[PDB]
Design a protein around this ligand. Structure first.
Ligand SMILES: Nc1ncnc2c1ncn2[C@@H]1O[C@H](COP(=O)(O)O)[C@@H](O)[C@H]1O
Ligand SMILES: [Cl-]
Length: 297
């Protein structure tokens, strides 16, 4: 983990930095410290450690954790969320996968459904797709804004850079408020290359046990790749803060993606210095006494 820990620091997006995904963030790390087999063992320790942290977090009831995932189709997002959940307790973890908004949801501001779904003290909430969709798919297809009664947009011509700027400000305000009121916010962008996306799409199409699930509408979003990259770059450049950071994770090799994310969550949550509750003398005496009754039956 020694070398890996330094590399992980590079994946965080600093507040003042500017973003060029093609040029400066590699979708696949060439100087991988370790073998895939070593990586799998490390990931296994990470999930176990993350599990212990979750238990301490549930037992204290002082903070909540919100973890966000955004990615292009076939970046491994869903599978990564899956792998994390299998390791955790279901009692203090909730996954919400946001999809196209319902009628009721469209009658409220775009943040309302996310605010409603936030994690309570002691629990971890995972957003497999978040409020950031409102500056991503909605920026590429501004026509969706016409179905939002609260957006204030009657024609696509009305939307300019100032509108996305205002949303970035709204989002930053929402995340700063929850950060100041107990929530730890960690955001991950899984960054997959165009080439690798293509290779995964073809693999899915070819497998008779995956292709029932393949949706050809994913191809439409692939054709808007440059539009999405611009949406992603502008968002990362304005919504990553020290309090609520974005991490860009290379997604071309899945085992390495998962390892990176687990390492980063552990490291960030380790700053809370969580411990298990201790047993006091009064509590110790009650336990001994309870044990004495069981023996005397
Ligand atoms: N706020 C939103 N507005 C419009 N579409 C969204 C929003 N949030 C999620 N979606 C879309 O809903 C879909 C989720 O369905 P799936 O990933 O197929 O389960 C993805 O295409 C998202 O981009
Ligand atoms: Cl790119």
């Amino acid at each position: 983990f020694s070398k890996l820990s330094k590399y992980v620091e590079t994946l965080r997006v600093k507040p003042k930095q500017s973003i060029d995904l093609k040029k400066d963030f590699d979708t696949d790390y060439d100087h991988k410290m370790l073998t895939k087999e070593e990586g799998e063992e490390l990931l296994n320790l990470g999930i176990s450690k993350l599990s212990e942290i979750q238990e301490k977090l549930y037992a204290s009831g002082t903070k909540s954790v919100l973890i966000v995932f955004q990615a292009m189709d076939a970046a491994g997002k869903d599978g990564t969320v899956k792998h994390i959940m299998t390791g955790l307790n279901p009692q203090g973890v909730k996954v919400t996968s946001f999809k196209v908004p319902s009628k009721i949801e469209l009658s409220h501001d775009y943040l309302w459904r996310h605010y409603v779904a936030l994690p309570a003290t002691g629990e971890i909430g995972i957003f497999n797709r978040s409020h950031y969709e409102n500056v991503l798919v909605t920026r590429v297809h501004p026509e969706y804004l016409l179905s939002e009664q609260t957006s204030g947009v009657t024609a696509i011509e009305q939307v300019n850079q100032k509108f996305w700027d205002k949303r970035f400000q709204q989002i930053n305000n929402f995340e700063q408020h929850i950060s100041e009121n107990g929530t730890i916010v960690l955001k991950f962008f899984l960054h997959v290359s165009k080439k690798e996306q293509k290779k995964r799409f073809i693999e899915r199409i070819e497998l008779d046990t995956k292709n029932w699930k393949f949706s050809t509408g994913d191809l439409k979003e692939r054709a808007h790749w440059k539009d999405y990259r611009n949406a992603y770059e502008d968002m990362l450049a304005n919504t990553s803060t020290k309090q609520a950071p974005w991490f860009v994770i290379p997604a071309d090799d899945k085992w390495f993606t998962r390892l990176l994310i687990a390492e980063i969550i552990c490291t960030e949550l380790e700053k809370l210095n969580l411990t298990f509750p201790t047993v006091s003398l009064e509590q110790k005496a009650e336990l001994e006494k309870a044990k004495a009754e069981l023996v005397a039956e």
